[PDB]
């Protein structure tokens, strides 16, 4: 019983774990706490890039955005080295996904515009994909576990990623950009990627936070090219606001999923 094995991971890592793998043409869905709420953390930056792509012609990727050192907010590996030159919308999409760049995310939200610095518009994009539960409220706080702001569920975000990467939410040219940025992500080697054999292809977007939060959302392809969406979320609310996030938990959960899918 796979659910028994997920529960053992919860006890061993003193953590709460959520998993959703949508059913496919030849597999049943995998689900564990799939409708419980977990913080987005940085995983929202993947659908955020999709929302910007959706709303604009591809020429928009060449638009140069200027900003100052005081605009550097959240962990921003790329943006904080390009204050003087600025960054194009396309470079900001790249940084937001592949380096979780918080400033890039803030600028892409500002590009959507509207109240809340773009967070209302982003949430509306998720509504348009049929996601009735997720919400984004703040820009790049260690939100308490009970707070519903800035949360999703494994079920909800997996079905969002399913439509974006494997469905028709985006035209093929915009779909290919999103897929490529996730494929060359730099932050995910020790999470879902670490749970799948080397001949599976893995694209992903991570998130990490207080209360021991560690997330990874991925699309994987078997060695013969069959794709599956895998969403894994975790936290450790009982360990306090500074509980250690555990990448090994996500890797071990992904290993259990890979055993089901192989
Ligand atoms: N949250
Ligand atoms: N913003």
Author numbering: 29 to 83, 86 to 145, 145A, 145B, 145C, 145D, 146 to 166, 170 to 238, ...
Lines quoted from the article behind this entry:
The crystal structures of BlaC variants PD, PDDS, and PDDSH were solved at 1.3, 1.6, and 1.4 Å resolution, respectively. Between these mutants, significant differences are observed in the Ω‐loop. In PDDS (blue), the loss of the negatively charged carboxyl group of Asp172 (to Ala) causes disruption of the low‐barrier H‐bond of D179‐D172, which was shown before to stabilize the Ω‐loop in WT BlaC (Sun et al., 2024). As a consequence, the chain between residues 167 and 172 is only partially ordered, indicating mobility in this region of the Ω‐loop. The initial mutations found in the selection screens are located in or close to the Ω‐loop (P167S, D240G), and also in later rounds such mutations were found (D172A, D176G). Also, two mutations in the gatekeeper loop were found (S104G and I105F). As the name suggests, this loop covers part of the entry to the active site and lies over the Ω‐loop (Feiler et al., 2013), and these mutations further enhance the accessibility of the active site (Poirel et al., 2001; Radojković & Ubbink, 2024; Yi et al., 2012). Some mutations stabilize a single conformation, largely eliminating the peak doubling (D172A), and others stabilize one part of the protein and introduce new peak doubling and, consequently, new conformational states, in other regions (H184R). For one branch of the directed evolution experiment, we managed to obtain crystal structures of the successive mutants, PD, PDDS, and PDDSH, showing the opening and increasing disorder of the Ω‐loop in an otherwise defined protein structure, suggesting minor structural changes.
